[PDB]
Amino acid sequence: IISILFKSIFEVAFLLIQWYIYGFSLSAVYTCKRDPCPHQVDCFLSRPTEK
Amino acid sequence: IISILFKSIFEVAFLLIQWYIYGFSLSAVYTCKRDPCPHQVDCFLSRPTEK
Ligand SMILES: CCCCCCCCCCCCCC
Ligand SMILES: CCCCCCCCCCCCCC
Ligand SMILES: CCCCCCCCCCCCCC
Ligand SMILES: CCCCCCCCCCCCCC
Ligand SMILES: CCCCCCCCCCCCCC
Ligand SMILES: CCCCCCCCCCCCCC
User: Fold this and answer.
1) Pocket residues: Cβ below 6 A from ligand 1
2) Where are the transmembrane segments (chains A, B)?
3) Beta bridge partners of residue A42, listed in sequence order
4) Beta strands, E only, B1-51
5) Bridge-partner residues for B5, per DSSP?
6) Which of A48, B2, B3, B27 could staple A26 via S-S, CB 3.0–4.6 A?
């Protein structure tokens, strides 16, 4: 029983973490505002739809 | 008299136009926000202090 409970707990925890960090989709264009980049810059991902 | 008046008028008009457009100094770094440039970009002048 403990093993089954822990399996479910880990599954739920990983799903929640993924939802918080990324969501469940990826966009083609990303806006970056981190040094040393000046102001904001546009970046482009690889294979967003397939992913 | 008319010629002297017009000389002075033209001088004042040109000074006012220059003050409105540029001022009386130039900075080394310029911020550009015009298409097709994305977001804002930084540009650098030539010989700002001498000018
Ligand atoms: C000797 C008892 C073995 C049964 C273990 C079932 C519980 C496993 C919990 C896993 C916790 C996470 C470890 C990385
Ligand atoms: C089963 C794995 C648990 C891992 C817990 C780690 C938490 C990750 C950090 C949470 C977000 C921090 C944002 C500052
Ligand atoms: C069993 C439920 C499966 C449906 C999950 C749908 C998640 C939302 C995905 C939205 C993607 C839209 C394309 C950008
Ligand atoms: C025949 C009279 C000549 C005297 C002319 C003095 C006035 C000049 C006015 C200039 C106006 C701007 C012309 C471009
Ligand atoms: C003696 C020369 C007179 C020239 C007058 C031209 C005015 C210049 C335009 C004024 C600024 C327009 C901002 C939209
Ligand atoms: C007769 C008065 C002459 C003084 C004019 C000064 C104009 C202001 C210039 C400021 C430049 C400061 C360096 C960026």
Assistant:
1) A 2-3, 6
2) 1-21
3) A31
4) 29-32, 41-44
5) none
6) A48
